[PDB]
Amino acid sequence: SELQLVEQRIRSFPDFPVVFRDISPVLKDPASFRAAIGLLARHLKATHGGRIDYIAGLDSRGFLFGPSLAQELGLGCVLIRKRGKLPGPTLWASYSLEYGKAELEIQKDALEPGQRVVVVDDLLATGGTMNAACELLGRLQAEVLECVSLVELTSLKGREKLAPVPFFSLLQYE
Amino acid sequence: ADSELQLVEQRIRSFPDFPTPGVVFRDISPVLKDPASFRAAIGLLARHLKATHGGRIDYIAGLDSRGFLFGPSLAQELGLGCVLIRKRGKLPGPTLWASYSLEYGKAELEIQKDALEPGQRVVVVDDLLATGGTMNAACELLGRLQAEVLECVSLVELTSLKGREKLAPVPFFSLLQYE
Numbered sequence: 450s451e452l453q454l455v456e457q458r459i460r461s462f463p464d465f466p467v468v469f470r471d472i473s474p475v476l477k478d479p480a481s482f483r484a485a486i487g488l489l490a491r492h493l494k495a496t497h498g499g500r501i502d503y504i505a506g507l508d509s510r511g512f513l514f515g516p517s518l519a520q521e522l523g524l525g526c527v528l529i530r531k532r533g534k535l536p537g538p539t540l541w542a543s544y545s546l547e548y549g550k551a552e553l554e555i556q557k558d559a560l561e562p563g564q565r566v567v568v569v570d571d572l573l574a575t576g577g578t579m580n581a582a583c584e585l586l587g588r589l590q591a592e593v594l595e596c597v598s599l600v601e602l603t604s605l606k607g608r609e610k611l612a613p614v615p616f617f618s619l620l621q622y623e
Numbered sequence: 624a625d626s627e628l629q630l631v632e633q634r635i636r637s638f639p640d641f642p643t644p645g646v647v648f649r650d651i652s653p654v655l656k657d658p659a660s661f662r663a664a665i666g667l668l669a670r671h672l673k674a675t676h677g678g679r680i681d682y683i684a685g686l687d688s689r690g691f692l693f694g695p696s697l698a699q700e701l702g703l704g705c706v707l708i709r710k711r712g713k714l715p716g717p718t719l720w721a722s723y724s725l726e727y728g729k730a731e732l733e734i735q736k737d738a739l740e741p742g743q744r745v746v747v748v749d750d751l752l753a754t755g756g757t758m759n760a761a762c763e764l765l766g767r768l769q770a771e772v773l774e775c776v777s778l779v780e781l782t783s784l785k786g787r788e789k790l791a792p793v794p795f796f797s798l799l800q801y802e
């Protein structure tokens with residue numbers, strides 16, 4: 450099955466850097482990658498029809514899926530970057546993730562008020578990163594339709610921190 | 624010009640003195656935001672690589688982080704897997720790393736020791752070539768794994784910084800060139 454093609458390509462590294470779920474094998478197997486993008490695209494098409502304006506990809510591992518998913522849906526991809534990386538006027542927000550702290554940034558002209566966005570990242574843990582991205586999109590007055598990822602770590606309850614924003618993952622681990 | 628190249632060129636913006644005085648920053652963000660532009664970029668790079676290597680590529684290597692924006696899409700377009708070369712400290716398991724200089728700083732790149740087997744054929748992709756330091760480091764790590772680096776490609780090339788000369792004799796190709 451398609452989902453199995455993705456599932457078979459997650460490898461785990463205990464005690465890095467925590468059981469680190471490595472998405473690398475998904476990228477390295479063209480069949481696995483196409484299955485992951487296809488499943489995500491199919492989901493978003495079915496759930497939001499044609500109400501999506503842009504995909505937003507989260508620096509850095511989110512960059513691996515964002516543009517491909519956007520392309521599969523005939524949509525542009527906007528970039529939400531680690532602070533200090535984007536040129537021109539920006540907004541930023543600080544946050545905590547599973548194994549540290551960071552800050553995200555977005556260009557002020559990335560989106561206009563009301564525009565509809567789906568945020569994509571590789572993996573959802575505590576939900577801190579995804580929430581910060583939602584906060585930034587919020588300051589631009591964009592509407593966040595949904596957040597999605599390849600992997601979700603259910604024990605960390607990231608889904609709860611995003612509620613009531615819908616969240617969808619292809620794979621779940623405790 | 625090729626109408627396809629024009630869809631990419633018209634979506635590059637410039638910012639003076641970011642992130643430090645003297646740098647003219649080429650912002651690729653509009654290319655990603657315009658699906659037609661992004662689509663053209665990937666197609667142009669794929670077409671070049673098919674014509675130049677006749678399908679004899681095993682993997683595309685994408686360079687953290689703006690290289691990640693093009694690597695997987697290009698790989699997919701070619702029916703290929705994409706391997707990651709990351710900023711040091713980000714990849715799990717046994718790794719190799721190398722220090723380098725880029726146009727406006729210095730850093731360290733890293734690759735997993737099992738990313739590639741000896742003799743496997745790779746093309747490296749990044750968003751922009753400036754001094755060539757980043758791509759050179761990637762090539763150095765790929766060489767440690769005994770990978771054959773066939774070519775390096777980017778969307779943008781800043782010709783005054785002579786990055787291409789630093790990569791020689793590894794072939795290089797860019798869609799767009801600016802001084």
Ligand SMILES: O=P(O)(O)OC[C@H]1O[C@H](OP(=O)(O)OP(=O)(O)O)[C@H](O)[C@@H]1O
Pocket residue numbers: 507508509510511545546547548551570571572573574575576577578579607713
């Ligand atoms: O749900 P959370 O607890 O926020 O964790 C999830 C985030 O952590 C990782 O990013 P990281 O900051 O390691 O940077 P990277 O994307 O460059 O690996 C991962 O790629 C997610 O973005």
Ligand SMILES: O=P(O)(O)OC[C@H]1O[C@H](OP(=O)(O)OP(=O)(O)O)[C@H](O)[C@@H]1O
Pocket residue numbers: 534686687688689690724725726727730749750751752753754755756757758786
């Ligand atoms: O030819 P060079 O002089 O090495 O410069 C080009 C490199 O520098 C930039 O990366 P940066 O280190 O800014 O990180 P990013 O990819 O995360 O933006 C750019 O994305 C290239 O990777």
Ligand code: HPA
Pocket residue numbers: 467468469470471546547548572574602
């Ligand atoms: O446990 C994890 N595994 C992989 N990536 C991550 N990003 C945040 N937490 C994790």
Ligand code: HPA
Pocket residue numbers: 646647648649650725726727751753781
């Ligand atoms: O001048 C630049 N612009 C954009 N990205 C870059 N990465 C290195 N130099 C540059």
Ligand SMILES: [Mg+2]
Pocket residue numbers: 507508509510511578
């Ligand atoms: Mg991340």
Ligand SMILES: [Mg+2]
Pocket residue numbers: 686687688689690757
């Ligand atoms: Mg870079």
